[model samples]
Target chain A: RTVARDITLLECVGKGRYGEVWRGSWQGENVAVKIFSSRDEKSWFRETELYNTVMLRHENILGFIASDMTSRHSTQLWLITHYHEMGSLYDYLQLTTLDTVSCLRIVLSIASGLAHLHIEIFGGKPAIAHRDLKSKNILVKKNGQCCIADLGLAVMHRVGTKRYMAPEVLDETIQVDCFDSYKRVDIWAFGLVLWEVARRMVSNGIVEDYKPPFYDVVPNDPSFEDMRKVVCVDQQRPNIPNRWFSDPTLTSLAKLMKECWYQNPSARLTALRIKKTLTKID
Target chain B: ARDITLLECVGKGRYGEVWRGSWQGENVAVKIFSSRDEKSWFRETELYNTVMLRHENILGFIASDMTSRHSSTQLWLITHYHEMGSLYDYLQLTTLDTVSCLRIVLSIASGLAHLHIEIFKPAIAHRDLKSKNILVKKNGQCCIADLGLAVMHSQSTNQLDVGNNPRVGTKRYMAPEVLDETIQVDCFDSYKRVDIWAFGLVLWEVARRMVSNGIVEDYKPPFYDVVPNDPSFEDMRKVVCVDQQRPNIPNRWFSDPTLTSLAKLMKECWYQNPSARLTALRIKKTLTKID
Candidate 1:
């Protein structure tokens, strides 16, 4: 019956535009507390409202615990959530390689979380879209699976990373009013995430070096105009290494990722479909 | 095969008539909506479709169907039937012991907690919670019914969308903010606070009928002395908002420890400020400590 109490800040683990993320302790349990900058107060409120409105406890989605406000010198906001020791997928992939089963497990968990967010039940939930989805925004769990995080820019009604922007989004042709348009954008990003994981999988005594999507075409931090030219004008996509064709699992994943990069948003594979395909890969 | 036979008319209200029906050789309650009250039926059906809504203290929803009879379409919502009827009617006939009184109030709180908390997804507010909306079962437990005026919250938009139903709550149980039109309708917590106010009134009603040292007051609707029967909104506003009057608590209540604890709980629920009112979950926790 007792409510969540104040958490003791232990150490800073990550930092971003919102603020620094600290590994805090409460009742002898470790919890991740994301401190929000004063300028990004709206994002903190939006995420806290979403957590209070819905009981969003899922294995593949980041677990939300409590939201608290503290005052010292100025107003400080905190979003408390479950702590994972493995950090983000981006960091995990940099140090360790993946096997066929581990690669499928990571992608499948991400797809499960995205599907749960996209599908709206008649009496239960509203459809949610992760406007900004990338390797850095996903946390790798100790179970070898991934959970989606950083819902600061997520929208239910839809800004996104330039590298993961869909063709329709890059060309400014997406229907902003339609809810399905936002889901399609997430699917495109899911494809890129799958590609990133696939490149790390050790297939037939061979593995491609990890690289961000459009690493060859665009600069490290491509601007909006720079991404649009390569994605829309040239209709360029991430290359599928010839090494992927050697393994059956990689071959099937290569084919599935291609379906996500279609010029027409409607033709993209849904999160649910992508999940089912990944389950069949092994 | 899913058809039901209307055995007898059990109750009637502004919405429509409720019948004790026989479905598959078992008893079920059929709530038939009039053409003018079709929206109530739709809203109730929508609420029942929510994921993981079935709970021990919540009324079980079986099926909702639209059938033609006598050249007019009749909307039917079938649910589990309780022969003992509503809590309001049961309280009038039976005087409760200390144990029974605590059981009734605790069960009601558990039901309200289920409705208010979103353990699965999307919290719901039973905007018209009252003694009449609570049904007594054969096992002496209570289940909450009548979700026509419920409101739902969407996590994606972080917004609460009150349903399109035009039906207002019973005037006798209207909170001060509702009577004065000072409630913030866009906030989901506002609706929950209103329900908490009515819950306080319900606890008051049940406590009056509890036998303490052979002294039990007769069961009466809240504000029976201040407001007239079937009072207007303006009349309720004057008594609850302007006068700031609440139901009387007899001196005998303070003599018993159980009634004294309930009195304090009800007072917390009746706070003038909506945010100051205890949540349904908090009420359940307080009631659990009484034993």
Candidate 2:
């Protein structure tokens, strides 16, 4: 039966510069609704198309439900989805600690998702690369496995993201745009996120209020210009603590992370290679 | 589930107001359009009704509402929610690999094919096709959104007069015939070709990520010089329809085998004889043919 139910508004969950996200209830179900500026209607329309096509189901993916439109002088698009109160992985890493198994499971789960996307299957054909693969887009589940989310700017084979971007991405001198460059960038970001997660697996746990990946080396939110000058122009890599090399576990982790941060994207490990390494970690 | 309420004004546009709202203990995206644009509103509503719940490539219009309090009527169209926002926002942050890019492009081509060939009666034309019109769902599926500028293969019943003419679309993606109004006859194939041309441009856009900054600081169409305000058949003739200048693919892209292949496919779509250009169906076939 089609019930004429009025949507009930509840507490606001998060607020960003562009819009605010709120918790709401409809027919006794809890969902997260993102209210956006009308200026973003173009975006709203595009997003609506994607959600409508694919019902959210992946372990590493976010869920999308019904959208709401109303008749009023002020027209707003209501995007209802699964509410994950834990917030982003970026927030979670700063607060919690993980055992070795828990850490491997979390990072491996993300790799699995990425691998599924990057490699082509018989029916599906061709893989998909995640242009932005940072801690921000990695969401941890209650079970400890991590899911990769957000694919807005992802292209088939194009340069993207400055912070976790591969060196080849910034160097226009590379001439050719190849899958190797994109995959390398993702691997680099994955390494940094791996580092972030490894830091949390310590006895002391993550230090109070750790910021972005490699924040210690760069400090403030590094601009594209600054990043290009250092990581791109100078070919500098994020520093690996000397202490990390002393411990066997940290050494292995540091080595893997550094492999990802390689200036040459071609030298970076493939998703399959990373998965193999993760599985082999004792 | 939670009941959603429109609380305050969050955004405004040429269409209507966007509000921050709540629904089912979750945050939702709600769009309320101004009833003043009755024609545009009806066009969108009719298109939705024609093919609302079908096709994985098209944006879903969940619910629509019309309300009249005193004298004014407001139209609202609800849809799916995306927190990460537009593809444009993501492009600014990172570079994409072949697999991800092809998935998006193939999905779009499949969706476009559905629009142009699958629907009954006349084929639908997205008068405005651009990267801005494409949305990425949280699940990695791509959808075609916004039916405001959509047109069917019917007569010119909704035709506008001189000053009332709808400019309607982003310039960089406008097909030569569309910009110059050189379209002698309103044929579905011609319209489909227009979409294909725009699709090539969008593909190029995705391939390049952000456009180069120094060159005009803005992306311009292939036939930018010959077209004017009310581009007529004569104007289009001087450029695309007759003279035919397709968008240039930077030589830098040709170095990679994939880019080289993609550039070739795009050129086929921009063929002078619109008929010679690959059909949406053909484009899909060719995309599959590549690796």
Candidate 3:
């Protein structure tokens, strides 16, 4: 079924270079509305095609409600999705701590979603890769599950949340034109997301305060050179705390996420493989 | 500037209709595709958008849009219109001399060759090629159209993108391998080979019209005598595979040097073994060297 064009904006949920996402109302139901700024029209154009052409319905994926190139004093590129009030993983990790089950479920949900995106149905739809995959792009759900959001598109640009930049990305060695390259970049960011959620999980009757990946090594906003040195030259990954060993679940996660952070992109675990491992884990 | 005034309909098929439209007073071919065949529209749009595949012998693309007409979606593919229409239509009422015949076939060969070669762009194989899918330009040359069924192979990525849109080729021109269900789907060359087989049938169609000894043969599709009009898969398979018969080479062609050479060139494309089929480049070179 198609969503109605009429939607009313309530409050701005988030905004950045891509565009501002606002919580909106349609048919008396809350919907998250993303308005692509006049300058950043490419993402809206591409994402529009992605939604219309592909059957992008998945539980772990943010539901596509409607997309329209409407004019509200300006050509306002609009993409409306099902609203989740818990906000981003970046917001949730800092807002409240996650228990073992919740933490594993959240990561597993994202992995399942990412796997669906990575694999191309042999005789049907093509494979897709998530660019700019970071904690901010994932939204926590009320049911303790999570769904990936802000699946617009991008490579590395404007420092690019430098902490999330992979070693291959920092060194600028990736085959930028290749889809597999983009998948690897997504995998790298996914690994860091794994680490971020794991740190907040309760272990040995304690949990660490939410800190961004590589908090000790880089500045508050890491520079391109800062990450290039730390990620590429230094070959540093988020260190697993010794206390994580006390929890079998955290240990398994550490190993899985470690595979995602491999400097060798080809050596990195596929999303399908990661989901398979997560299913085997508690 | 985006407005197009729809004029007379140029063509129609099971998939959609093609309209002769005027955009800013310039003639354009607007192919209105049905949602059932929206797969072809998506396939063609994606291929053209990614590659700068402009060639004099290939149909020029203008724009693609999905319009909401009274809240119903219309898939539109706009292109440069050739007033003379498709080769299939042109060949029906008109016969040609040796020069025009050679010109028509050579241009098609050049366009097919351009599609099969990968340099800066991906190599594409037209999975559904026929006389109807080729248009005649003002300059007596032809441009290959209907890239909807095309498959692409990228050397850089080492990827074979077989869209496999479920749209099969024309049964009348089915190659032995295609008729027998032995066409290799994984091999990029197999797709190109399928094109060659169709190309051979197209050659037969065009060559029959070439005047030899002040006489020309009537336009008849390949295996016209053996197969019924709108031949089924079983009918095609019987004649093309089980019977192991090829389109008969007329005695009139032997008297004309051009027709004789073309007859030989197309034969190499009619091999039972797909591996033995001449490449598009080879066919183009043979057509170029035809005496």
In model 3 chain A, the worst 10-residue window by lDDT is A67-76
Q: What is the DockQ of each candidate?
A: 0.01, 0.05, 0.06
Model 2 residue A13 CA deviation (Å) reads 2.6
Which pairs of residues collide in candidate 1? none
| Lowest summed lDDT window (length 10), candidate 3 chain B | B65-74
A1-282 in candidate 2: lDDT tens per residue? 122346677999767543677887766887767776665444444444433322335666655555555434245656666667676788888777776688778788887877765665553334456777888777677877777755544434223446776666665544255665556667788887888877766532322234566466564756667677777777776666655555566667778887788776678788888889888887
Candidate 2 stretches with Cα past 4 Å from truth are: A3-7, A38-56, A67-75, A156-161, A173-181, A203-209, B1-291
Please report, in order, the local distance difference test score of every candidate based on alpha carbons: 0.84, 0.64, 0.83
lDDT score for residue B71 of model 3 = 27
TM-score of 3: 0.62
Local accuracy of candidate 3 as per-residue lDDT tens digits, B1-291: 345788888888888999998876798888989777867876776566544477899898876654342225566777899999989989999999888998999999999999999986899998888998899988999999988888999988999989848888888887788888987889999989999999999999999998889888899888899988889999999998899989899998998889999999889989898889899998989888885
Query: Candidate 3 at residue A202, lDDT?
Result: 92
Q: Which candidate is the best by lDDT?
A: 1
Give lDDT: candidate 2, residue A165: 63
